[PDB]
Amino acid sequence: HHHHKGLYFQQSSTDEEITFVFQEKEDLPVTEDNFVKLQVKACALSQINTKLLAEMKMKKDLFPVGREIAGIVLDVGSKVSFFQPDDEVVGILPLDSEDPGLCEVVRVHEHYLVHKPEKVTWTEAAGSIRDGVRAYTALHYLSHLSPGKSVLIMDGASAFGTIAIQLAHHRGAKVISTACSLEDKQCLERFRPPIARVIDVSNGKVHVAESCLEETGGLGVDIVLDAGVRLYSKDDEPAVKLQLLPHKHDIITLLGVGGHWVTTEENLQLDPPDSHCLFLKGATLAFLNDEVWNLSNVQQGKYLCILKDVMEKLSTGVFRPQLDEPIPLYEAKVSMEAVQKNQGRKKQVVQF
Amino acid sequence: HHHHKGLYFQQSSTDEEITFVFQEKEDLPVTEDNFVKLQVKACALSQINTKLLAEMKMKKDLFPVGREIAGIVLDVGSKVSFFQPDDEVVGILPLDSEDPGLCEVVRVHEHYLVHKPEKVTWTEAAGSIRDGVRAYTALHYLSHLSPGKSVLIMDGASAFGTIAIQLAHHRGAKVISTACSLEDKQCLERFRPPIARVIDVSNGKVHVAESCLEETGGLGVDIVLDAGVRLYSKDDEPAVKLQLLPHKHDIITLLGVGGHWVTTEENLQLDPPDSHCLFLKGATLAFLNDEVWNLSNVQQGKYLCILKDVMEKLSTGVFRPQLDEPIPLYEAKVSMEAVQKNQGRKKQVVQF
Amino acid sequence: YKKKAAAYMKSLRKPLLESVPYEEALANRRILL
Amino acid sequence: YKKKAAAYMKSLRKPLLESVPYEEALANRRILL
Amino acid sequence: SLSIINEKVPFNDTKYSQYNALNVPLHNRRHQLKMRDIAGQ
Amino acid sequence: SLSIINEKVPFNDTKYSQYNALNVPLHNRRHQLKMRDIAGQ
């Protein structure tokens, strides 16, 4: 009879082997007492950090797919306090969600949701939630902004980077950003706010440290939101997974005194020469991990406040996501695999 | 004729070989145009970070001794703006000072000084300047306090630790502190404010992580101002320089989610398993280095503001240094060598 | 929530797989070849 | 001040003495013995 | 302070009291131990 | 905000304007380049 179709990740050979068609949900009710049922209007796609699922270790054969959701509240459990039916909310499904985001209705814990401000549409908001929060995480908790500090956004041209740059400009930061394609440099040219400099790694010569340092004129860069590090493949199998990431050492010299390096790279080898370089420069090293708020979820209130303020930024127009043209649900799986391979630099959103 | 006696460090065999008697200064005038001459009233002693002098690489045979000074302004150069003669100031001599602190008059750059608040004596203030600033550095720039966060002060019983603890209590933090001697536990008992817990490493069993973790009840510790790490001597020559420092791993598990580890250790080996542990816990790692403000001296204004606010804390009574009985100048060299070997846990101050 | 986070780090804790050989290893790798 | 700090990091810069052998080194140290 | 409150605190978590309650507070052990013996008594 | 300004900003550097000037400002290159060509002209 009535059925709701949900895509499911399969756990095999530790990573990179996700596949299956969406499987039915039959007669799903709104059981539990803090989980609300949504008419899902939009679901954003993100590359699944599968290795994190594996070390996180839940034992499912099928994992729910889709986590960045916007929709309308159909009904609530009895203990629900902040939400009423017909309300319009947006949010991140938890990493250990029972229900997939690739489905037109969803049962979700109420404190993963925030109300949608009236000015923003469904698809933009839903495509902005995840990069808005990891960026806001990067620039306001791990690294502490204030106007006048210099911020380096490496691979700022990507979908995440646009929100990182616009957050930094919104906080009065001066931004140096790295672009990989010529077209990505063109996108940095296309920014309505004028960024301080565009630094190009497109050429075979890599001049990230030297050129970026002379942009700060020897003062140095305070906040480097580096996307990745080229470390541990320098002498063995260069460019693993065809990566032309920045070298660790050029970044570490590049960091200014008292600076903040916020890094994404999961396996980081800090050599004693490097830790002496940081010791001399009094630098802080912080690790960016968005999903600490769902899996560990200790400071749930802080994060919940973050999302609504991110929406207040979206309502003011500070954020503008890098959306692709939205897609129907049944074509998402064919897209998802390439999204699973790499980001397309355009945010892909399923609209309902 | 009239002479002023100044102790001088000699650079030999890269460290631990400091010795010489104080050498005369004859007919020293107040030359230069931003350097003021002080009647020095008090000079605090600190272990010389000689390795930092060696890699800092200035080429002197004699290095000036004494840097934590309090005194009265005798006269100023023509470009001096913030200071007049007879004024009463306190400050840190720079690491590359021309003149020693172990001398009754000093020529010093004017922006290393701050006025002494009327309530505090010379010897307490001068013995508080250096640990006040490195502590204030630790707890307000590298690590960001707010009441409610949990702070671990490892070896809090030492001279530095008393200022670190009192700063943390002054900022509403709850403190867990480690004590090495039984008498050091007794000192933690002697604090008028009651610290949350005293954790003892005196016994052969080391239970720093387990007991500290259960004090946070599984929530975890946010801010660990660790004095040192036991890493890199675990399998080869255990307890180098007779150290019973905390193991790296127990600290890293001990750190709470989103926590701040502020570390002193110059050579830090961060293994990829550890950097995955930090990646999971979203932790920040920062390096405490007080003397970035003299040698690099980029944010001179911030630091200068720090010292006067540290004095405002001293005037209110928030800080109370762990002073030894003050000494005359000629007996300081005999003390200094042991101070050079290790801190005596009582601050040693020469009073003029 | 509080029980969840406590469960988080109790899951997260891993035994001391001690590995600090870098200072000797830098010589060791090169000399071995 | 600004010239001093610029001089600070220009002094501070050190050449890329590349050393990331840990993942193979963990096996290498043990097997060598 | 007009600009200063904007500069030092760009984002605040205390905008919402209702959410502010939700975040986990510090695990004060001492109060629990006092409730343990007092409840036993 | 009474307690909040105390909580979020325990220490301020803007207490003293005179010292606040002393700290090194950001090395804006663009303004310098404009003065370079304009001064040459």
PDB file of N, CA, C and O in Angstrom, chain A residues 82 111 136 140-141 145-147 171 298-302 304-306 308-309 312, chain E residues 3 6-16 18-25:
ATOM      1  N   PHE A  82       9.078  22.396  22.192  1.00  0.00           N
ATOM      2  CA  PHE A  82       9.407  23.536  21.358  1.00  0.00           C
ATOM      3  C   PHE A  82       8.675  23.546  20.033  1.00  0.00           C
ATOM      4  O   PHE A  82       8.870  24.478  19.252  1.00  0.00           O
ATOM      5  N   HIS A 111      15.453  18.181  19.170  1.00  0.00           N
ATOM      6  CA  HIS A 111      16.529  19.127  19.393  1.00  0.00           C
ATOM      7  C   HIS A 111      17.582  19.053  18.318  1.00  0.00           C
ATOM      8  O   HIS A 111      18.679  19.583  18.488  1.00  0.00           O
ATOM      9  N   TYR A 136      30.782  27.379  10.863  1.00  0.00           N
ATOM     10  CA  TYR A 136      30.578  28.198  12.043  1.00  0.00           C
ATOM     11  C   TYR A 136      31.328  27.609  13.224  1.00  0.00           C
ATOM     12  O   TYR A 136      31.835  28.337  14.082  1.00  0.00           O
ATOM     13  N   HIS A 140      34.233  29.823  14.894  1.00  0.00           N
ATOM     14  CA  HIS A 140      33.855  30.460  16.130  1.00  0.00           C
ATOM     15  C   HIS A 140      34.117  29.672  17.396  1.00  0.00           C
ATOM     16  O   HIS A 140      34.004  30.244  18.482  1.00  0.00           O
ATOM     17  N   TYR A 141      34.463  28.408  17.319  1.00  0.00           N
ATOM     18  CA  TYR A 141      34.793  27.705  18.544  1.00  0.00           C
ATOM     19  C   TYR A 141      36.231  27.246  18.555  1.00  0.00           C
ATOM     20  O   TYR A 141      36.963  27.524  19.508  1.00  0.00           O
ATOM     21  N   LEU A 145      37.534  34.279  15.904  1.00  0.00           N
ATOM     22  CA  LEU A 145      37.646  35.431  15.039  1.00  0.00           C
ATOM     23  C   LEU A 145      37.466  36.721  15.804  1.00  0.00           C
ATOM     24  O   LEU A 145      36.976  36.754  16.933  1.00  0.00           O
ATOM     25  N   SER A 146      37.854  37.786  15.141  1.00  0.00           N
ATOM     26  CA  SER A 146      37.698  39.187  15.478  1.00  0.00           C
ATOM     27  C   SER A 146      38.194  39.898  14.238  1.00  0.00           C
ATOM     28  O   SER A 146      39.085  39.368  13.566  1.00  0.00           O
ATOM     29  N   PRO A 147      37.600  41.022  13.857  1.00  0.00           N
ATOM     30  CA  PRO A 147      38.128  41.796  12.734  1.00  0.00           C
ATOM     31  C   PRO A 147      39.571  42.207  12.963  1.00  0.00           C
ATOM     32  O   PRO A 147      39.980  42.531  14.077  1.00  0.00           O
ATOM     33  N   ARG A 171      32.527  38.619   9.716  1.00  0.00           N
ATOM     34  CA  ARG A 171      33.172  38.924  10.973  1.00  0.00           C
ATOM     35  C   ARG A 171      34.373  39.817  10.777  1.00  0.00           C
ATOM     36  O   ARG A 171      35.250  39.870  11.640  1.00  0.00           O
ATOM     37  N   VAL A 298      27.244  16.517  23.682  1.00  0.00           N
ATOM     38  CA  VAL A 298      27.263  16.984  25.049  1.00  0.00           C
ATOM     39  C   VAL A 298      26.702  18.390  25.147  1.00  0.00           C
ATOM     40  O   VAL A 298      25.805  18.654  25.947  1.00  0.00           O
ATOM     41  N   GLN A 299      27.170  19.304  24.322  1.00  0.00           N
ATOM     42  CA  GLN A 299      26.723  20.685  24.369  1.00  0.00           C
ATOM     43  C   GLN A 299      25.638  20.936  23.329  1.00  0.00           C
ATOM     44  O   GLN A 299      25.754  21.783  22.457  1.00  0.00           O
ATOM     45  N   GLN A 300      24.545  20.192  23.498  1.00  0.00           N
ATOM     46  CA  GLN A 300      23.431  20.213  22.555  1.00  0.00           C
ATOM     47  C   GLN A 300      22.813  21.590  22.444  1.00  0.00           C
ATOM     48  O   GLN A 300      22.375  22.002  21.364  1.00  0.00           O
ATOM     49  N   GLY A 301      22.745  22.299  23.565  1.00  0.00           N
ATOM     50  CA  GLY A 301      22.196  23.639  23.555  1.00  0.00           C
ATOM     51  C   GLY A 301      22.998  24.608  22.712  1.00  0.00           C
ATOM     52  O   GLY A 301      22.422  25.396  21.957  1.00  0.00           O
ATOM     53  N   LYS A 302      24.331  24.548  22.817  1.00  0.00           N
ATOM     54  CA  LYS A 302      25.193  25.450  22.062  1.00  0.00           C
ATOM     55  C   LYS A 302      24.991  25.260  20.577  1.00  0.00           C
ATOM     56  O   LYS A 302      24.697  26.213  19.859  1.00  0.00           O
ATOM     57  N   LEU A 304      22.465  23.828  19.077  1.00  0.00           N
ATOM     58  CA  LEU A 304      21.118  24.145  18.663  1.00  0.00           C
ATOM     59  C   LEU A 304      20.988  25.640  18.454  1.00  0.00           C
ATOM     60  O   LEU A 304      20.363  26.084  17.487  1.00  0.00           O
ATOM     61  N   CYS A 305      21.621  26.425  19.330  1.00  0.00           N
ATOM     62  CA  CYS A 305      21.657  27.872  19.157  1.00  0.00           C
ATOM     63  C   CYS A 305      22.395  28.245  17.878  1.00  0.00           C
ATOM     64  O   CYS A 305      22.035  29.227  17.209  1.00  0.00           O
ATOM     65  N   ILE A 306      23.434  27.465  17.540  1.00  0.00           N
ATOM     66  CA  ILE A 306      24.266  27.743  16.368  1.00  0.00           C
ATOM     67  C   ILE A 306      23.419  27.702  15.123  1.00  0.00           C
ATOM     68  O   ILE A 306      23.517  28.577  14.263  1.00  0.00           O
ATOM     69  N   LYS A 308      20.152  28.051  14.602  1.00  0.00           N
ATOM     70  CA  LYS A 308      19.209  29.144  14.451  1.00  0.00           C
ATOM     71  C   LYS A 308      19.926  30.440  14.133  1.00  0.00           C
ATOM     72  O   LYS A 308      19.419  31.249  13.355  1.00  0.00           O
ATOM     73  N   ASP A 309      21.094  30.667  14.731  1.00  0.00           N
ATOM     74  CA  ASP A 309      21.840  31.853  14.337  1.00  0.00           C
ATOM     75  C   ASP A 309      22.380  31.742  12.916  1.00  0.00           C
ATOM     76  O   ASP A 309      22.493  32.756  12.229  1.00  0.00           O
ATOM     77  N   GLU A 312      19.602  32.817  10.982  1.00  0.00           N
ATOM     78  CA  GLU A 312      19.512  34.272  11.034  1.00  0.00           C
ATOM     79  C   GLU A 312      20.503  34.918  10.068  1.00  0.00           C
ATOM     80  O   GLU A 312      20.183  35.913   9.408  1.00  0.00           O
TER      81      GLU A 312
ATOM     82  N   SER E   3      30.497  49.066  19.774  1.00  0.00           N
ATOM     83  CA  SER E   3      31.230  48.205  18.850  1.00  0.00           C
ATOM     84  C   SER E   3      31.913  47.059  19.577  1.00  0.00           C
ATOM     85  O   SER E   3      32.125  45.997  18.987  1.00  0.00           O
ATOM     86  N   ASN E   6      30.018  43.874  20.062  1.00  0.00           N
ATOM     87  CA  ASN E   6      29.979  43.206  18.771  1.00  0.00           C
ATOM     88  C   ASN E   6      31.305  42.524  18.459  1.00  0.00           C
ATOM     89  O   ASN E   6      31.320  41.406  17.933  1.00  0.00           O
ATOM     90  N   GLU E   7      32.425  43.195  18.736  1.00  0.00           N
ATOM     91  CA  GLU E   7      33.731  42.637  18.401  1.00  0.00           C
ATOM     92  C   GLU E   7      34.061  41.405  19.239  1.00  0.00           C
ATOM     93  O   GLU E   7      34.396  40.346  18.693  1.00  0.00           O
ATOM     94  N   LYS E   8      33.995  41.529  20.564  1.00  0.00           N
ATOM     95  CA  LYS E   8      34.444  40.449  21.436  1.00  0.00           C
ATOM     96  C   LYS E   8      33.493  39.265  21.392  1.00  0.00           C
ATOM     97  O   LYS E   8      33.923  38.111  21.487  1.00  0.00           O
ATOM     98  N   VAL E   9      32.199  39.525  21.261  1.00  0.00           N
ATOM     99  CA  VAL E   9      31.218  38.447  21.276  1.00  0.00           C
ATOM    100  C   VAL E   9      30.428  38.516  19.985  1.00  0.00           C
ATOM    101  O   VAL E   9      29.342  39.106  19.957  1.00  0.00           O
ATOM    102  N   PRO E  10      30.972  38.020  18.880  1.00  0.00           N
ATOM    103  CA  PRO E  10      30.181  37.997  17.649  1.00  0.00           C
ATOM    104  C   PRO E  10      28.995  37.063  17.729  1.00  0.00           C
ATOM    105  O   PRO E  10      27.896  37.411  17.282  1.00  0.00           O
ATOM    106  N   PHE E  11      29.188  35.893  18.317  1.00  0.00           N
ATOM    107  CA  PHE E  11      28.134  34.918  18.507  1.00  0.00           C
ATOM    108  C   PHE E  11      27.946  34.719  19.989  1.00  0.00           C
ATOM    109  O   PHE E  11      28.913  34.619  20.742  1.00  0.00           O
ATOM    110  N   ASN E  12      26.698  34.612  20.386  1.00  0.00           N
ATOM    111  CA  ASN E  12      26.360  34.376  21.765  1.00  0.00           C
ATOM    112  C   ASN E  12      25.494  33.130  21.806  1.00  0.00           C
ATOM    113  O   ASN E  12      24.748  32.851  20.869  1.00  0.00           O
ATOM    114  N   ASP E  13      25.614  32.364  22.880  1.00  0.00           N
ATOM    115  CA  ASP E  13      24.775  31.197  23.086  1.00  0.00           C
ATOM    116  C   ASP E  13      23.633  31.477  24.041  1.00  0.00           C
ATOM    117  O   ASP E  13      22.731  30.650  24.182  1.00  0.00           O
ATOM    118  N   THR E  14      23.671  32.634  24.686  1.00  0.00           N
ATOM    119  CA  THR E  14      22.748  33.033  25.728  1.00  0.00           C
ATOM    120  C   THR E  14      21.609  33.854  25.139  1.00  0.00           C
ATOM    121  O   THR E  14      20.802  34.428  25.879  1.00  0.00           O
ATOM    122  N   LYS E  15      21.563  33.947  23.805  1.00  0.00           N
ATOM    123  CA  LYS E  15      20.443  34.581  23.120  1.00  0.00           C
ATOM    124  C   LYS E  15      19.149  33.870  23.474  1.00  0.00           C
ATOM    125  O   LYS E  15      18.090  34.493  23.587  1.00  0.00           O
ATOM    126  N   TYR E  16      19.223  32.555  23.628  1.00  0.00           N
ATOM    127  CA  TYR E  16      18.077  31.709  23.891  1.00  0.00           C
ATOM    128  C   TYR E  16      18.294  31.066  25.253  1.00  0.00           C
ATOM    129  O   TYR E  16      19.237  30.292  25.422  1.00  0.00           O
ATOM    130  N   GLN E  18      15.982  29.109  26.773  1.00  0.00           N
ATOM    131  CA  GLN E  18      15.343  27.806  26.687  1.00  0.00           C
ATOM    132  C   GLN E  18      16.292  26.759  26.130  1.00  0.00           C
ATOM    133  O   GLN E  18      16.330  25.629  26.624  1.00  0.00           O
ATOM    134  N   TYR E  19      17.059  27.107  25.104  1.00  0.00           N
ATOM    135  CA  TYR E  19      18.072  26.187  24.616  1.00  0.00           C
ATOM    136  C   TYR E  19      19.216  26.095  25.600  1.00  0.00           C
ATOM    137  O   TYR E  19      19.829  25.034  25.740  1.00  0.00           O
ATOM    138  N   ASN E  20      19.528  27.217  26.261  1.00  0.00           N
ATOM    139  CA  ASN E  20      20.661  27.292  27.174  1.00  0.00           C
ATOM    140  C   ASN E  20      20.533  26.287  28.292  1.00  0.00           C
ATOM    141  O   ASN E  20      21.541  25.768  28.773  1.00  0.00           O
ATOM    142  N   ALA E  21      19.309  26.025  28.732  1.00  0.00           N
ATOM    143  CA  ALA E  21      19.117  25.000  29.747  1.00  0.00           C
ATOM    144  C   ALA E  21      19.510  23.623  29.227  1.00  0.00           C
ATOM    145  O   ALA E  21      20.032  22.801  29.985  1.00  0.00           O
ATOM    146  N   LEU E  22      19.270  23.367  27.940  1.00  0.00           N
ATOM    147  CA  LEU E  22      19.379  22.016  27.398  1.00  0.00           C
ATOM    148  C   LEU E  22      20.798  21.465  27.446  1.00  0.00           C
ATOM    149  O   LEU E  22      20.982  20.263  27.657  1.00  0.00           O
ATOM    150  N   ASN E  23      21.802  22.307  27.230  1.00  0.00           N
ATOM    151  CA  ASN E  23      23.181  21.832  27.234  1.00  0.00           C
ATOM    152  C   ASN E  23      23.596  21.296  28.600  1.00  0.00           C
ATOM    153  O   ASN E  23      23.096  21.736  29.635  1.00  0.00           O
ATOM    154  N   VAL E  24      24.430  20.264  28.572  1.00  0.00           N
ATOM    155  CA  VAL E  24      24.842  19.516  29.762  1.00  0.00           C
ATOM    156  C   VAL E  24      25.610  20.415  30.712  1.00  0.00           C
ATOM    157  O   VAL E  24      26.589  21.058  30.300  1.00  0.00           O
ATOM    158  N   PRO E  25      25.244  20.475  31.982  1.00  0.00           N
ATOM    159  CA  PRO E  25      26.007  21.250  32.956  1.00  0.00           C
ATOM    160  C   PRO E  25      27.106  20.394  33.566  1.00  0.00           C
ATOM    161  O   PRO E  25      27.158  19.182  33.378  1.00  0.00           O
TER     162      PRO E  25
END
